[PDB]
Amino acid sequence: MELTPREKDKLLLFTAALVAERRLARGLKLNYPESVALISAFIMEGARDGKSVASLMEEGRHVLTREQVMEGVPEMIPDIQVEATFPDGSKLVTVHNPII
Amino acid sequence: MELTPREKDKLLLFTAALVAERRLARGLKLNYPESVALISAFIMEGARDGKSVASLMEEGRHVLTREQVMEGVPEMIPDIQVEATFPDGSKLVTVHNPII
Amino acid sequence: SNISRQAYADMFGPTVGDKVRLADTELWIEVEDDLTTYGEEVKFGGGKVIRDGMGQGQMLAADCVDLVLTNALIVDHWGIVKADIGVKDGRIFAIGKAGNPDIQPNVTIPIGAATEVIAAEGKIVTAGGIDTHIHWICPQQAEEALVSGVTTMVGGGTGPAAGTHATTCTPGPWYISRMLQAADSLPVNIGLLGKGNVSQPDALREQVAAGVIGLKIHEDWGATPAAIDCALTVADEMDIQVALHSDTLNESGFVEDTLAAIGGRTIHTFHTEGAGGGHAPDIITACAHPNILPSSTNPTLPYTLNTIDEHLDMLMVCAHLDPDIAEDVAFAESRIRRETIAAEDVLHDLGAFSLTSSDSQAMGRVGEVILRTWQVAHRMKVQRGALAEETGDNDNFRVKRYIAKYTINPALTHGIAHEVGSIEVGKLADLVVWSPAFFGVKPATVIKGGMIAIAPMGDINASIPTPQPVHYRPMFGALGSARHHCRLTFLSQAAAANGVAERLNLRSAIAVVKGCRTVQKADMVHNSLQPNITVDAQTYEVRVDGELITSEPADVLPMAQRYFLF
Amino acid sequence: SNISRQAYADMFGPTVGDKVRLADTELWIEVEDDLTTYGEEVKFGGGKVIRDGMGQGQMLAADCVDLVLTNALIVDHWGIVKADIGVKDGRIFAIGKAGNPDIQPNVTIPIGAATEVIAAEGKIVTAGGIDTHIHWICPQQAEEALVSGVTTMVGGGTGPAAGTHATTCTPGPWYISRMLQAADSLPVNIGLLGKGNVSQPDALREQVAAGVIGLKIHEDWGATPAAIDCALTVADEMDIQVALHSDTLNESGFVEDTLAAIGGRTIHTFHTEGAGGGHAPDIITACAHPNILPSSTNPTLPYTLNTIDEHLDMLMVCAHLDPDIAEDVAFAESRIRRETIAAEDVLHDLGAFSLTSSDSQAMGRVGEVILRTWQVAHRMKVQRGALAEETGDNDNFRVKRYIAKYTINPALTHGIAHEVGSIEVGKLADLVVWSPAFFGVKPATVIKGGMIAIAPMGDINASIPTPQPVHYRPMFGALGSARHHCRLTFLSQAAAANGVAERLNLRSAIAVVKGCRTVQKADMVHNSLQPNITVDAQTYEVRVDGELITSEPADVLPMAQRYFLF
Amino acid sequence: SNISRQAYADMFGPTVGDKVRLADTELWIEVEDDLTTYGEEVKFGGGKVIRDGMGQGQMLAADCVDLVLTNALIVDHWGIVKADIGVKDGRIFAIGKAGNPDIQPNVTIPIGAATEVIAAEGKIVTAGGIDTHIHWICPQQAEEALVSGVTTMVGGGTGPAAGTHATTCTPGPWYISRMLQAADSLPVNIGLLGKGNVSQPDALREQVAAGVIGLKIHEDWGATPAAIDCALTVADEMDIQVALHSDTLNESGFVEDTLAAIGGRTIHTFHTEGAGGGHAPDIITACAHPNILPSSTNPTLPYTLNTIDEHLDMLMVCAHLDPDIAEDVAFAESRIRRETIAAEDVLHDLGAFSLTSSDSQAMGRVGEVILRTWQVAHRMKVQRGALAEETGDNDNFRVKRYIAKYTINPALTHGIAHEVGSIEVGKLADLVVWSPAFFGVKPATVIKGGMIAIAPMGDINASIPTPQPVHYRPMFGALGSARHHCRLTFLSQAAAANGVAERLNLRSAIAVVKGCRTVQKADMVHNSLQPNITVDAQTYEVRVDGELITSEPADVLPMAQRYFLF
Amino acid sequence: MIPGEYHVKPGQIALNTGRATCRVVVENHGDRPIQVGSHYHFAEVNPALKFDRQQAAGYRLNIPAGTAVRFEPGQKREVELVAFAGHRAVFGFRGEVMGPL
Ligand code: NI
Ligand code: NI
Ligand code: NI
Ligand code: NI
Ligand code: NI
Ligand code: NI
């Protein structure tokens, strides 16, 4: 595989997302780290599919709503940022006020 | 659990395989690292079940086909090797030209 | 006897006339020369050539090399040739024909009892990359860079602090001393840049005397004509380089005023295209001057479909700006221009821009300097075709022009070319071994000072080094004292003379920078063009000799989704 | 001109009169003072104030600070004020108004070419925590503690061995020497405790001469009146502190006998509530004496619903007990008492208990010393309301009282307050930067000796430091020699004089403990209460002046499920 | 009073006459002796024996041990006994009865204020393993080996380079010096092997003078009679060991010619069975000679169902062979023989083969040397029953015979038995503590030079060291200077005399090898058989005194799927 | 498109040109296989191979570098040799020359 440090680091993010993904499935209100991880992993898969940066900046605001997270969590996340390999190389996706 | 460094290292492989496994489910054509990880994890579970080295050397060539991976990927993988604990201890499984 | 060319290729790697495509790009190189004697190639293994009395001689250590890279395909600014590489005392000893003079002809690289062997047949060997725009935001950047193929890192910083997030400056004696001590722990050659923004010369001399090999003028600390003039004066008397990031706001004057302040003195302009910083919107015109050594930072290389979208938002978090404050956002659009972003790629292809760097964690990707340089080459071949200098049906010249951008050119610009920057005898043995399919993306081996420092490694408990999982792990060349012995900390001539290494009790090898004031655009290997370039103040259109310079954004690039897991 | 208070807050952080809630607790602090001159605040960035000739002067390194923390909101035992923090030579230089005297008024902290900047506007800055009850069970405890905001660790141990699992003792010269050498590799200030249980004075003197800054009397090694008397005698002649864990079994006598053996000599009582060890069931009465410096260990802080259930089982694995042997379990119920567990929280709120510690991996959580101290504060405000000392509509006094428990008080108790423990000029620059929303839970930056040692860091290959995943990674202040230069190994005056640092060839900075015998309860900042406390031998009820002291168990706490992934 | 044997076992571990099964194997050991005085056993904990004035005395540091392993069940080549182990100055002080002479009888190991305690009741203690066939392909191999219970590693290499992938050779002065410096960073004792394939004596002397403790003759570098003779001549004059991997191709002669070249001089034959290398197909006959010290590499131990299948493919990647080239594959079948693979297991059981090693990442598993040795013992008991030397209804002799294979025998073979190899007074305290259920698989504690270096450790922030996840983490004995003090770098007498340690500025303790030329087969503890063994040139059948030597392949083995996650 | 693919021009490479060569009939009289490397001094191969050792003096096999010729027991075959170059000094092998020639 020849995994570089950055690829191995993203495996940590992906695994953190698996944790949140299951808790949301149970119907729990997600906390701070669970929310950032869930929305971040969504964006990474978005890039893998070849969606544009512009598309993800928008779709990323519809992953979790205010009624799916704990009190005060939406304000603790003014934005979320993550990079992934798009068809045209590494790009940065910034999602402002992701939870509403 | 008393996990040794080698057991912890395999957890990285297993997790890399989870990534590929989902992308294949989406119907994406797998890239280089995703392919090596997917086929490798298959073999590890094979050993866990108690399949012989000879059996896995063959079954490992039928995990992914040429139409399920990106262009040029089958040639980037002339073989795949992985070790796992079989009923009779650690053994090495070599799969030649796994993707066809 | 006789052997077919294909079987030969499979056994000893390609020879004269054979072509090899670089990774998954449209770039093809052709072996220009082979320094071997057919039938006398050295190969390692059971029953092979390198054995006592055969390809291995009876000479003592002093008369043979320590390491030999067999059947290597060298790609460097001077040629794309097949030959053996001999390494002795951590330095490139020779490039020739390895073997035993006792029984073999034309041996220039003797193999003895004391010689280790690295089999490079079927592999491409290149010098280690040199990134001169590093922000020391975190120590983890070194391993990242090393894994990508960059063996030398020049920049400034003190860690994740506002000043370093924004600028490449290790402020003052205390932080310089501290960072020089921390550098011994890192597996790459390091040189530090101090804060050059001051109108008092002594405040700069102290920093150079403390140990920095250059000074960074950054607009966030005030890139005024007085500050610039001051830094260049001390640079001229201490033989150190100046890196510039000009006044984007045009607060103290326009590009022509900064250029006037510089007064024809030598200077390395960071991110010359401007997105990463500089006079809006014509900082790019600097590439026309003989005293300017221009470089690009990597997020704009090459021009793609998602480039502009990603940029508006990135340029905020870096400079510590505010989207609510109009003045903090009005220049964002003046700083990010599609027009100059597209011209930059073309300017590299022409040799107008001479270096590529990252701008690590401050609008740049530390592990993508090599990767993006080749992506630009691929895209330019696709769009513009062959270069006027090409000869034969290959891309050899374009490859030499682009590889020089992150190897020899950065070394010349910062006065370290006497130590690193290329595969030439006498230079430190910082080499990278690549498999053609992963060229520019994932190295097979990264050698520092004659010792492998990082390489892909499989299951540690496996019966061989190849079983999964295979990921990059630190080797012996990155351990304690072995590392100290295989890396260089670059000091200024003043610091060296002052006994800084002894005072801080530095453990690594020490090198000294020199020749920073005499280099000019004409000295940049394969990239010495001085175009008559203009920028339209309103349309932002870039023009060279009246003709419009532009390019189209890529939708898909090589060295991307086929190699990475994320 | 004029600026509204809200916009001002968003730009430079809160000012006089503004309140900020700490994390998700019910605690509110109010800025008591602001040391700036309105309109002259220093801010870093493009076009901002800190630029040559503007907010940055022309002075040489010796005349300006090395690091400046701009617009900081300081929370310390002495005040909750807004000001700039200047750091020079790894020490707190000043707390005032930073800038350039050339063009700005009231500058007490000069910024020059050699000054690095850390933007603290909108952030809370506090001293580094000090945990004095560490069991050196594993080296990994240091990073854990550092990430939580604890910069100094005092304790004893030799690794995961039965003796260390149970007690904070580095037994004898050999293990002391070995652990002192190992300490150079850790990114926190360290002081060691030896085994103080001996009735032969010379066996103790040797340990102090070997390097320990204190001695631990633990019942597992025999906390008899003879052992106690012996340790205190040597402590008195060598100026080192004694930490006690008394005879729980009442084998040699009751609490009053131990107190008699102590004879009014200075002593730090570990886990004074008793669950973590001590005379059953009245070891808590010790907090009434002027010579006793009482502390709590953290698993009992604060009293919650799952506290008792978890405790019965935890108290087994630690002391190396057996659930089958009746005598090994009969005292479990005598040691874990709801009555004293509830009184402890109240006693902290009143200032009867003066310190908080962990008791790492031996009935304590190394990374939760700060976290739990604030949870107790929150719970006490909720139950008891405002403290008699409060002034204004805020919780400023309660905050000062509780922060002192893990900062200055532990430093006074162990004779290191001359070096660390608070933000006061001359003290080592061990500072922690917090974002109000994560106060007490997850630090934005942890500074050791003037260098960032650990901080949250995102994707290393990213274009900025913020992209995911963001987790704590070691910085330059934690690397080789830079670390040695930014950390302190505390020695006893005897060891220092004997040349122990030179003999073991210790690489870090060395500090010496002093003033361990003269501190008394009256010296504990904000926590000097000596209550007339009694414990009912049968009901275990705690009473102060006849009134019953108790509290209710919490079902949910702040700084818990909203911040952690597991 | 009186106590039943079962309760006694549960409290202090098994005593004389009690049996314990090793892990999940069919092997049973029986306590042969107990050195305690019933009722006077020392136990640590609250209310237990080791307390001031009781089981702990008043003696100064010089008169008591630093560490005491209480109630240990020792398994060594000399006995399987119950006793206390005293460690002083990093060395085994005594094996006897620990306590306080003041009030206890028969105390030979005094416990004082300076004594740390490790509770070994119910645990098995053994010496640290010694692997003499290490390929330094990556530094990560050390932690892997340490975790398995191997405390000393002897081999050669320079990292992941072709030469090292294939051979255990650190080629020449430069690489030897570099690797010796890198060794200070590793937590295991290390000794290096140089490239012994040369027909010029001076090229070898230099390597020994540079620091190697032995020379490896490998067929890939030419294992010719001239090379062999040359290496043995220098070995004889410098007192260093020679490791051999003979001419598999029979190019320079057959096994009898190599044996002739050796001329009765001392030599350690690597992988004597032959699969891992050596004259095809009778290299195994070497075990019949008095001057040959034979060892096996681990992938062939023991003979199982998947052995042959896995081997054909493994033997390719290692030697750098090619499946297309007929000559590169024709000998694969000549090298991998079911006949010799089955005889090897039996030969170990008989004491014909004296050592076990790994052959790390070059046809061997670095973390399975101990594990596989016991799997062979289990399989041999199952197939052949009790050994002729067994006494009583136990497997004590077979256990002593097999444990010697990776402890004392490897130490004798390489001239380091004066320092390590067994639990005997005066030897370095390299000890491993095992829980009977995990014997040979996963250690409870690994002690290096008197300090725990690696051990299983649970949640770092937990209230105790046991909560999940529990995995192996480095301890204090593996940190900076503490590690340097607890590990040994073995030098040759020449290098030591030449001042190599001082010149390279080596930080660890230094030991010197001696007695490499005088050891012979008769000196191998419990494994000195010299069978009249023959191999049929065609059928490859192994015969000892005419009788056929063979065994059946296992389908399932202990110490496998029940303990590992992958 | 195959990443890193070669485009080898067709043809052949002539090996060890301009050097003396000779042919020798060799036969393995041993009972175990023998394999000889390309650069091994032929005159000093395993004594079980019967051939004119006097003719093979200073010669090695004329085969591509790194390859080998195997001789099964009883195998008889004619091989082509090529003369050593350089200093023509043989050191090592069975130790029969250990000097020039
Ligand atoms: Ni810039
Ligand atoms: Ni920059
Ligand atoms: Ni305690
Ligand atoms: Ni404790
Ligand atoms: Ni071998
Ligand atoms: Ni080997």
From Swiss-Prot, chains A, B:
Single GO molecular function: nickel cation binding
SUPFAM superfamilies xrefs: Urease, gamma-subunit
Gene3D superfamilies xref list: Urease, gamma-like subunit
Regulation: The apoenzyme can be activated in vitro in the presence of nickel ions and carbon dioxide, which promotes carbamylation of 'Lys-217' of the UreC (alpha) subunit.
Record pathway: Nitrogen metabolism; urea degradation; CO(2) and NH(3) from urea (urease route): step 1/1
EC number: 3.5.1.5
InterPro entries xrefs: Urease_gamma, Urease_gamma/gamma-beta_su, Urease_gamma_sf, Urease_subunit
Subcellular location: Cytoplasm
Family matches, as CDD domains: Urease_gamma (cd00390)
Keywords: Cytoplasm, Hydrolase
Field pH dependence: Optimum pH is 7.75.
Catalysed reactions listed for this entry: urea + 2 H2O + H(+) = hydrogencarbonate + 2 NH4(+)
GO CC annotation, single: cytoplasm
Segments forming a coiled coil: none
Top-level class of the enzyme under EC nomenclature: hydrolase
Gene Ontology terms describing biological process: urea catabolic process
UniProt similarity note: Belongs to the urease gamma subunit family.
Quaternary structure, from the entry: Heterotrimer of UreA (gamma), UreB (beta) and UreC (alpha) subunits. Three heterotrimers associate to form the active enzyme. The apoenzyme interacts with an accessory complex composed of UreD, UreF and UreG, which is required for the assembly of the nickel containing metallocenter of UreC. The UreE protein may also play a direct role as a metallochaperone in nickel transfer to the urease apoprotein.
Protein name, UniProt field: Urease subunit gamma
From Swiss-Prot, chains C, D, E:
Entry GO CC: cytoplasm
Active site: residue positions: A319 (proton donor)
Ligand binding (Ni(2+) 2): K216, H245, H271
UniProt xrefs under InterPro entries: Amidohydro-rel, Metal-dep_hydrolase_composite, Metal_Hydrolase, Urease_alpha_N_dom, Urease_alpha_subunit, Urease_AS, Urease_asu, Urease_asu_c
EC number of this enzyme: 3.5.1.5
Effect of mutating K216 to A/C/E: Reduces activity 8000-fold and abrogates binding to nickel ions
Primary localization class, coarse: cytoplasm
Pfam families documented for this protein: Amidohydro_1 (PF01979), Urease_alpha (PF00449)
Cofactor mode of binding and number, as noted: Binds 2 nickel ions per subunit.
Keywords, ordered alphabetically: Cytoplasm, Hydrolase, Metal-binding, Nickel
Residue numbers carrying N6-carboxylysine: K216
Involved pathway(s): Nitrogen metabolism; urea degradation; CO(2) and NH(3) from urea (urease route): step 1/1
Modifications the protein undergoes after translation, according to the UniProt entry: Carboxylation allows a single lysine to coordinate two nickel ions.
Name assigned to this protein: Urease subunit alpha
Organism encoding this protein: Klebsiella aerogenes
Gene it is expressed from: ureC
Curated annotation (Swiss-Prot), chain F:
GO CC list: urease complex
Keywords: Cytoplasm, Hydrolase
Family (UniProt): Belongs to the urease beta subunit family.
SUPFAM superfamilies (UniProt xref): Urease, beta-subunit
Protein name: Urease subunit beta
Gene encoding the protein: ureB
Single GO molecular function: urease activity
Catalytic function, reaction form: urea + 2 H2O + H(+) = hydrogencarbonate + 2 NH4(+)
